[PDB]
Design a binder for this molecule. Structure first.
Ligand SMILES: Nc1ncnc2c1ncn2[C@@H]1O[C@H](COP(=O)(O)OP(=O)(O)O)[C@@H](O)[C@H]1O
Ligand SMILES: Nc1ncnc2c1ncn2[C@@H]1O[C@H](COP(=O)(O)OP(=O)(O)O)[C@@H](O)[C@H]1O
Ligand SMILES: Nc1ncnc2c1ncn2[C@@H]1O[C@H](COP(=O)(O)OP(=O)(O)O)[C@@H](O)[C@H]1O
Ligand code: BEF
Ligand code: BEF
Ligand code: BEF
Ligand code: BEF
Ligand code: BEF
Ligand SMILES: [Mg+2]
Ligand SMILES: [Mg+2]
Ligand SMILES: [Mg+2]
Lengths: 523, 91, 531, 509, 80, 157
């Protein structure tokens, strides 16, 4: 009975904002917000996401959950995008971008209710944002002396590891700050900290080697080298065998002589190529390329420990352990191209054999490995996610004064509430509203930390407030009585991170408000 | 787009007259054997299941059902013959 | 009459439909018109979010099935494909045009009379434009005027603060490629490299040329400060016999001898170049780019001599680089002279994790810049480009056509009025043909109305104001340009605000919309036959 | 299945009659546009008859025969398309009664119609006046005539111009008739945008293909053109060319040879000192280089049709093998070599400041196809006159003349043979009528007057389109090629004669 | 070309259907020895189509008809 | 692809005359006309109509054939109506009402072709009809003496 008009396209779905769409979207976002609102903080919980190909995953991190889910709401995909910015362009703070970007849009509808224009709320929010970055540049309490002194590193990575893997917060950050120093010179690349893991025992057995460990075996009878300093090593892009011709290349034979002779002929020609290099002192050659049969045979005689490592990304990070250099052809291993290794033996870890490549002092390495032991593969993975979170935050404290740092535990956030509102009822006009809201928004970081801590938020929140109006160290007592003090534990979110986040969350949350109509299509 | 009879067959032409003739011929040739002193006889087992055997051309042409308008008149004139007379029906 | 299958809207039903549809498409794009338009977010059947406010975007990005909606779309695309701007305006113009015409068709007037009127009005409109335009001196170096053209055709799709970020980046680009002293320009010489990470406000203007494919080798130059630049185009990697070939070694190491024999063809042509980086700056004061490939072994040779070697470059960069540096696009290496390399100051390869990004900074004779669009996501990186293009082809048009037109619908509200009182005392038209020109006239008021309809202030009211504040300076003589102020609700001087509609756009918008509409109106039957 | 008898006949007639019925409102100066939807996708917004009927699949055999009539007619003259359909119908229709009502056998009705055709054709040439195929002004106001009734009229004058300026350009008398291959020598090129007037008839060609190498001439003053079939890259052997190498430094040897032959090839070309080398096939990067410093710009990949038109406006005869490359194969008589960049799309020109390239501009890729077809009609009636300098009274005048001279004769023939003859006369009258109708005036009224005025007062008196009153042709003139009036009546009477030969229709291969 | 025509185009110009230039053991189309004498070879047009004509010849005597009709439907039958 | 407009009723079929409908109808009539055109006259033929319930019928008469058929064309039902008038209100002449009513509409299109209005053809036809009844009242040759004399009856029947 009911007609239908103005249609000539194909079978889409247009959600005009003049149909209360902005809120339909706030809803969709509101839903995935609650998922992240309980993952943040040391008191955060994990979620087991089960892959669309069927794989288990457990992670405290936010940018990862979202990644592994099949999001579909356009207004939501936008905030999942911002959680990508954070993980790529910072590795840390991924969780805080969500909670804010969402909370922004939450206290955003309160305004839309009154009558505040879209464009008015946008403007007021940006005005409040730029203003918010300023204070952070000066709300900054200490700043690490850029000391890079191993112990100074542990003061930074420890608060990042807690609230991701809180419990082994130190056994971890210590375990990484030790991997980073082994590669940091004396007057950064994240790749130089390859991480391995294997089922067995618990984390108490986790280690830090001055080089990577490999799974495959040494190939020749050359099992494992000696325990006397220095070992000349030669890497190869080319495979150990008589090269061939990219255009065909078949052996021809006109007379029996050719044959009878070709047989043993190539036999020694291989010995030749092998010999000569074994001679230059080499004794361990890592083969990124294949390895011929006769080839290894002769080398077997020359006690040359081999190690097929086709991983061109592993082989390259390997050379930066010993000092050697990858050699495209075969035969001219200049005494310069070669490198030195202190240890290159085979240890059984958790029951299975693996080949190592470390050093105990001499010949420093620019690629260390963190060997994590664990029992549950699942958990063991979320740990390697934390190791990355820390490393990412270290590579970020570099060159352009990344040391800067402000109070963690939301202590900073509470201050930021008042401080942004300062600008609030200070700016004339109706923008004053949105600017004040933008401030309320920052109450999620504290409140949730308390909420996740089983603390009656209605108590910790006012407490932490009046306790902020010299002493802007007072944060949320994760564990008790009212609040606690940041300083009381040397815990704080560095500026570079928490600042870039606020900027990404404000973009995400703002673009969502700029859309005043949506169009979809059948999939 | 309009019509004038709702899918209901109807033939015409000169052939139409010829169809009808031949149609009747059939029903005719059918009885030709039951003629004469040494005349052949028929055995009709109608869809009824009642089995009959006779020569009263009327009785045969009555058991043949026959629906062809034209050829169906041969069934009528055979019945009348078994009335106003009583014999000759075959002929 | 007919044969089975095949449908066909006939009589005034066909016209009913045609106008129906047009009016429709019109309303659907009215929203993204004017700086005070609407940002739609459309997603495809794969989930590719994309933002817009550019009629063209929204238009070619949708699946339309209405025949009339196509002929109007295609003619609108054919406009962004020539003037690069005004794709939205033209759909409204053919829409509103059919509405205004349908009113007199509905009263009786044969369509052929409303089409006749249209052509008549059209000419008179295009005459009036040539008298309305503003010849601006070919004198470039008036970056001030051009920066108002940049912002004009930008606020039509930009985050406001970002307008101020892109307004220069576009103008400087157009200029940078434009060849002063009348002459001409080919926008293709303005590379538009775009990369993720960091919002679309962070985008930058490069006076040189930025590229992806960096020097893919460890021991390569992280940054070649001050050096020559070789425009290469010959295959610097392994090759094969153009005719079927194969090796056949009979001897144990004959194998080996034949091994190097293959690579030797490389070094043959590869030497002719390596000694060039000796024969020039063979003592330090350098970089080859090459359109084709560069296999491993070769990258060593270049990395050995500290020669930043790039491979597989965008082939149109031959010409772009041949301006960023000067050096000839060296196809073959034989007749290769050391006096034909190009020159660039700092040429550094910013590595962004797995991503390589070689820049060709510091140039003497640029003549070919690169607008580097930055942006956190893909949706923004998309729209930001579609904004630059629609606003770059926009400035370069101010140059090609040495005229400009005041915006805020000044020209429309003008031509509109003109035609009204024109024929009243012109009669330089026809009989009952006055209808058509009357419509066309009233029609034109689309842009001004719709412009404010989007802003907010009542179309009918504010347009009335312009009609007043206008003749005010006519009953007092003197010429005063008037437009709709989409911020207050009063009129204003477009020229004073810095609001300009490119001339070639208006010339191809009117002649265009009329072409469609006027040919649609003469339609009386929509067939659909021929399985 | 089967349908013999008048059954057949009728359905054929009605079928044919219906074909007409569709495009009858497309014949006349106020003719409407039948926007048709093709299966492939796009649309056709034309009112040019044949271009409509093509886009409509039909079923009834007669409707298929009736439909192809518009084609064979669109092949003789470019014009008079819709007219043949309408006539071809009315003829069959006007026979309908005497065909069955008056029980006249199809043989007899055919014997008469074939007779009445010839007489009718006389009356056409009888009223036709000749014309100065060379008088630019006459040709224009001739071409103009068949440009009305089409979207292209708002630039009518501008059109006949581009029409003549192209008919004459590709023309080439030759006598030992006049040969005008508009098809292969007047490649059109519709470019979206600009204004209509912004379109010209470049005396040369226009390719969008750019130049093979960046630093290459964007425009040679007076270029030396060299057109060739063969590609510009290392060729290979048309036999089992397989090379076996074990002789080490032999790889380099052969791999070099390739460069060597590309060199030779560049030589042979460079030899005749060329500036512009256009090949139909490819151009090896190497060959580009040796043709760069060799001093010439190169254009790769160009269609045969595109190329052979170049070789008529450059004289440069196209040559295959280069070791035979003669010097007669010059590039003389060829103006500039512009390479204008039209809206982000590079072009290349070859004008001289025998074959032209009409370049149209309008307001859409869509609107252009209207023009192109409209233009074709112009450019075709121009060609017709060029090969038959005779014209006929437009406004449907000719059509009415034949109506009377036939009507008169028929009435004075006596015999059953009269009725079919009479019908051809009654039939003809439909064109001035369709015209008067699509005008709006009263058919019964105007015709009786047109017919009467005709009966005595001159025969060049047809009906005026936008007006609706009967006017004398000579007066405001609108003569059309006499050739059109030939075909229109030749094949229409034939069509009728064919379908009337049918008394039975059957289905199955 | 249609080999069924050349066989008759040749008996008609007196020429010879050259299978392959040989004779004994050489190679030539043998100047006018194998060639045919024709009065004139022209490519006449016919709307849309355009074919070649070898009208007038040495020993031709031959002919060839070309129907022209309303359409293919009648035309096939005309010839038929 | 093709749209469709101005529809809000239910699924009918409207044959506007401005679509050459008058002739579509002349057709439908033209078809049943040929059936009656060969039944009239002593030289007329019969038709065997077979009932929609299946009964044979053979009749020279026209009003009967039409009765026993399943006519459907609205413009045709109208003329079948007139064949009823004749059979009820006269019993005879049923056949001649068809042949004329049809033939009238046949030579009627010849006029519609020229341009003659519908209403003009109507008027002219009535004018010609009333005029036609007049002559018949006087074209009358004999008249039976109303004798009713048995032999006089046989001259009529
Ligand atoms: N030891 C802790 N006690 C109180 N707050 C902490 C502690 N360690 C980290 N946090 C809080 O963790 C919050 C961030 O949550 P987290 O789960 O680390 O997500 P991300 O770091 O990815 O944003 C910061 O606001 C910081 O104040
Ligand atoms: N701020 C402004 N105030 C009044 N008019 C403006 C303003 N800025 C640009 N416009 C109008 O924007 C119109 C074009 O709309 P736009 O959204 O750019 O669509 P398109 O350019 O694709 O037609 C122009 O007619 C111009 O007059
Ligand atoms: N200017 C006109 N005024 C009156 N009749 C015209 C006029 N223009 C075309 N005609 C007539 O109408 C017919 C041409 O109409 P047109 O629509 O062009 O059909 P076709 O496709 O056959 O050309 C011819 O009979 C011609 O005499
Ligand atoms: F979850 Be976050 F990256 F610490
Ligand atoms: F068969 Be009959 F009745 F003798
Ligand atoms: F929105 Be338009 F294309 F400037
Ligand atoms: F209208 Be026609 F084809 F010129
Ligand atoms: F058929 Be009629 F009634 F004589
Ligand atoms: Mg963290
Ligand atoms: Mg614009
Ligand atoms: Mg014409």
């Amino acid at each position: 009975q009911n007609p239908n008009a103005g249609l000539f396209k194909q079978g889409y779905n247009s959600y005009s904002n003049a149909d209360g769409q902005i809120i339909k979207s706030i809803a969709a976002i509101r839903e995935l917000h609650q998922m992240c609102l309980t993952s943040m903080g040391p008191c955060g919980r994990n979620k087991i996401i089960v892959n669309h190909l069927g794989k288990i995953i457990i992670t405290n991190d936010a940018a990862t959950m979202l990644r592994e889910l099949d999001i579909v709401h356009p207004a939501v995909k936008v905030l999942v995008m911002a959680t990508e910015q954070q993980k790529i362009d910072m590795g840390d703070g991924t969780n805080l971008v969500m909670i804010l970007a969402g909370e922004l849009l939450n206290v955003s509808e309160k305004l839309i209710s009154m009558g505040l224009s879209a464009v008015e709320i946008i403007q007021g929010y940006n005005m409040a944002r730029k203003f918010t970055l300023k204070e952070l540049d000066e709300m900054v309490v200490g700043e690490i002396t850029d000391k890079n002194d191993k112990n100074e590193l542990l003061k930074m990575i420890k608060p990042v590891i807690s609230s991701k893997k809180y419990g082994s917060e130190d056994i971890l950050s210590e375990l990484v700050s030790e991997a980073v120093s082994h590669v940091l010179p004396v007057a950064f690349n994240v790749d130089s900290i390859r991480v391995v893991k294997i089922m067995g025992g618990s984390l108490s057995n986790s280690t830090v080697i001055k080089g990577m460990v490999f799974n495959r075996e040494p190939e020749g009878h050359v099992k494992s080298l000696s325990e006397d300093k220095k070992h000349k090593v030669a890497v190869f892009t080319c495979p150990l065998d008589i090269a061939n011709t990219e255009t065909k290349g078949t052996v021809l034979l006109h007379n029996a002589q050719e044959m009878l002779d070709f047989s043993k002929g190539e036999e020694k020609q291989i010995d030749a190529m092998m010999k000569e290099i074994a001679d230059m002192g080499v004794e361990c050659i890592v083969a990124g390329a294949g390895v011929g049969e006769l080839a290894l045979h002769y080398l077997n005689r020359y006690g040359i420990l081999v190690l097929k490592v086709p991983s061109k990304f592993e082989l390259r990070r390997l050379c930066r352990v010993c000092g050697a250099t990858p050699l495209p052809r075969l035969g001219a291993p200049t005494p310069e191209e070669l490198g030195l290794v202190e240890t290159v033996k085979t240890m059984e870890i958790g029951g299975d054999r693996v080949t190592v490549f470390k050093q105990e002092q001499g010949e420093i390495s620019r690629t260390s490995t963190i060997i994590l032991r664990g029992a549950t593969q699942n958990n063991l993975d979320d740990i390697e996610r934390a190791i990355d979170d820390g490393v990412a935050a270290v590579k970020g404290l570099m060159k352009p004064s990344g040391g800067k740092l402000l109070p963690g535990a939301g202590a900073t956030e509470i201050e930021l509430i008042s401080r942004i509102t300062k600008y609030g009822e200070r700016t004339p006009g109706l923008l004053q509203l949105a600017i004040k809201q933008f401030a309320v928004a920052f109450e999620v970081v504290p409140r949730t930390l308390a909420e996740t801590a089983g603390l009656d938020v209605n108590e910790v929140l006012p407490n932490l407030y009046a306790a902020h109006n010299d002493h802007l160290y007072k944060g949320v007592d994760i564990d008790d009585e009212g609040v606690k003090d940041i300083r009381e534990e040397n815990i704080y979110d560095m500026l570079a991170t928490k600042k870039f986040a606020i900027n990404v969350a404000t973009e995400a949350a703002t673009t969502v408000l700029s859309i005043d109509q949506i169009i979809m299509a059948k999939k | 787009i309009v019509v004038l009879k709702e899918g209901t067959d109807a033939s015409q032409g000169k052939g139409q007259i010829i169809s009808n003739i031949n149609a009747c011929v059939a029903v005719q040739e059918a009885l030709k054997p039951t003629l004469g002193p040494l005349g052949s006889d028929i055995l009709i087992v109608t869809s009824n299941q009642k089995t009959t055997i006779s020569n009263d051309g009327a009785t045969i042409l009555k058991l043949l059902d026959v629906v062809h308008p034209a050829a169906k008149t041969l069934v009528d004139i055979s019945r009348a013959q078994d009335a106003e007379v009583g014999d000759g029906t075959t002929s | 009459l007919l044969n089975p299958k095949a449908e066909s809207l006939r009589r005034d039903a066909a016209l009913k439909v045609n106008v129906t549809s047009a009016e429709g498409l019109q309303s659907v794009l009215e929203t993204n018109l004017g700086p005070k338009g609407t940002l739609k977010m459309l997603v495809d059947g794969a989930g590719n979010i994309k933002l817009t406010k550019d009629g063209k975007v929204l238009l070619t990005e949708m699946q339309i099935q209405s025949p009339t909606a196509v002929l109007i779309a295609r003619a609108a695309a054919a406009q962004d494909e020539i003037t690069g701007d005004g794709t939205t305006t033209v759909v409204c113009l053919v829409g509103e045009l059919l509405r205004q015409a349908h009113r007199f068709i509905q009263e009786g007037v044969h369509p052929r009379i409303i089409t006749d009127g249209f052509e008549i009005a059209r000419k008179e409109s295009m005459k009036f434009l040539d008298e309305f335009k503003i010849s601006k001196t070919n004198l470039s170096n008036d970056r001030e005027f051009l920066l108002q053209v940049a912002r004009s055709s930008l606020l039509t799709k930009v985050d406001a603060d970002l307008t101020e970020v892109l307004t220069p980046i576009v103008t400087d680009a157009v200029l940078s490629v434009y060849d002063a002293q009348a002459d001409n320009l080919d926008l293709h010489m303005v590379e538009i490299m775009q990369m993720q990470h960091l919002s679309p406000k962070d985008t930058t203007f490069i006076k040189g040329l930025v590229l992806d494919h960096g020097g893919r080798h460890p021991d390569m130059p992280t940054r070649v400060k001050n050096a020559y630049v070789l425009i290469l185009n010959v295959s610097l990697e392994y090759e094969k016999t153009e005719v079927n070939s194969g090796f056949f070694y009979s001897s144990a190491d004959q194998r080996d001898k034949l091994a190097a024999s293959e690579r030797k063809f490389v070094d043959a042509k590869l030497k002719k170049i390596i000694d060039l980086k000796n024969e020039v700056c063979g003592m330090d004061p350098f970089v080859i780019i090459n359109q084709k490939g560069i296999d491993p072994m070769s990258l060593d040779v270049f990395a050995k001599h500290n020669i930043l070697a790039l491979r597989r470059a965008k082939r149109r960069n031959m010409e772009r680089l041949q301006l960023v540096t000067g050096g000839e696009a060296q196809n073959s290496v034989e007749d290769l002279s050391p006096q034909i390399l190009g020159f660039s100051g700092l040429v550094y390869q910013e590595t962004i994790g797995e991503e390589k990004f070689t820049y060709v900074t510091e140039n003497t004779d640029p003549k070919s810049c690169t607008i580097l669009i930055k942006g956190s996501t893909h949706y923004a990186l998309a729209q930001t480009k579609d904004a630059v293009r629609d606003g770059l082809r926009a400035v370069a048009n101010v140059l090609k056509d040495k005229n400009i037109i005041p915006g805020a619908g000044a020209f429309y509200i003008a031509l509109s009025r003109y035609l009204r009182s024109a024929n009243m005392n012109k009669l330089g038209a026809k009989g009952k043909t006055k209808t058509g020109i009357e419509a066309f006239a009233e029609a034109l008021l689309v842009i001004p109305k719709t412009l404010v309809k989007n802003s907010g202030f009542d179309p009918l009211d504010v347009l009335a104001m312009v009609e007043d504040e206008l003749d005010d300076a006519q009953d007092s003589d003197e010429t005063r340009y008037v437009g709709v102020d989409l911020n207050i609700g009063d009129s204003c001087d477009p020229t004073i605000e810095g609001i300009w509609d490119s001339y070639r756009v208006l010339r191809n918008a009117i002649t265009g919309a009329t072409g469609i509409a006027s040919n649609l109106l003469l339609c009386d039957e929509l067939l659909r036959a021929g399985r | 299945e089967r349908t013999t008898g008048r059954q057949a006949q009728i359905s054929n007639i009605t079928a044919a009659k219906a074909v007409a019925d569709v495009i009858r409102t497309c014949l006349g100066p106020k003719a409407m546009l039948k926007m048709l939807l093709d299966p492939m996708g796009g649309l056709v917004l034309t009112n040019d008859g044949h271009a409509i009927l093509r886009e409509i699949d039909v079923a009834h055999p007669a409707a298929k025969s009736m439909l192809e009539l518009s084609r064979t007619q669109d092949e003789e003259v470019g014009d008079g398309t819709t007219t043949v359909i309408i006539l071809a119908g009315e003829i069959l229709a006007q026979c309908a009664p005497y065909l069955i009502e008056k029980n006249i056998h199809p043989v007899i009705i055919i014997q008469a119609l074939k007779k009445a055709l010839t007489d009718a054709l006389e009356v056409i040439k009888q009223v036709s006046k000749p014309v100065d195929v060379e008088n630019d002004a006459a040709m224009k106001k001739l071409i103009q005539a068949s440009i009305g009734t089409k979207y292209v009229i708002h630039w009518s004058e501008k059109m006949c111009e581009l029409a003549l300026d192209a008919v004459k350009t590709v023309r080439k008398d030759l006598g030992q008739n006049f040969e005008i291959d508009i098809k292969r020598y007047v490649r059109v090129e519709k470019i979206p945008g600009g204004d209509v007037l912004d379109s010209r008839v470049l005396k040369g060609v226009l390719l969008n293909k750019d130049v093979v190498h960046p630093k290459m001439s964007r425009h040679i003053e007076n270029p030396r053109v060299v057109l060739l079939d063969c590609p510009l890259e290392y060729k290979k052997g048309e036999s089992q060319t397989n090379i076996e190498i074990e002789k080490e430094e032999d790889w380099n040897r052969i791999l070099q040879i390739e460069e060597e032959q590309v060199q030779l090839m560049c030589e042979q070309i460079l030899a005749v000192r060329p500036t512009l080398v256009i090949t139909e096939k490819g151009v090896s990067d190497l060959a580009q280089h040796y043709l760069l410093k060799g001093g010439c710009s190169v254009l790769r990949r160009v269609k045969k049709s595109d190329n052979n038109r170049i070789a008529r406006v450059t004289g440069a005869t196209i040559v295959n093998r280069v070791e035979d490359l003669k010097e007669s194969d010059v590039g003389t008589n060829c103006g500039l070599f512009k390479v204008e960049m039209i809206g982000d799309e590079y072009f290349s020109f070859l004008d001289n400041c025998k074959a032209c390239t009409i370049m149209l501009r309008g307001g859409s890729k869509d609107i252009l196809n209207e023009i192109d077809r409209n233009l074709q009609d112009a450019m075709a009636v121009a060609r017709n006159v060029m090969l038959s300098p005779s014209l006929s009274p437009g406004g449907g005048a000719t059509e009415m003349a034949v109506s009377v001279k036939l009507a008169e004769k028929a009435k004075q023939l006596e015999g059953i043979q009269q009725w079919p003859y009479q019908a051809v006369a009654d039939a003809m009258e439909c064109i001035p009528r369709t015209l008067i109708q699509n005008a709006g005036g009263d058919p019964i009224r105007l015709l009786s007057q047109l017919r009467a005025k005709h009966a005595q007062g001159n025969f060049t008196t047809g009906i005026d389109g936008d007006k609706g009153k009967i006017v004398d042709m000579v007066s405001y003139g609108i003569w059309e090629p006499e050739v059109i009036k030939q075909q229109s009546v030749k094949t229409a009477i034939e069509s009728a004669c064919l379908l009337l030969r049918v008394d039975d229709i059957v289905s199955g291969v | 070309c249609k080999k069924e025509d050349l066989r008759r185009i040749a008996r008609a110009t007196g020429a010879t259907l050259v299978s392959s230039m040989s004779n004994l053991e050489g190679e030539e189309t043998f100047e006018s020895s194998y060639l045919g004498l024709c009065d004139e070879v022209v490519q006449a047009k016919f709307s849309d189509d355009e074919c070649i004509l070898i009208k007038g010849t040495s020993k031709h005597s031959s002919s060839s008809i070309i129907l022209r009709g309303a359409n293919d439907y009648s035309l096939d039958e005309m010839e038929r």
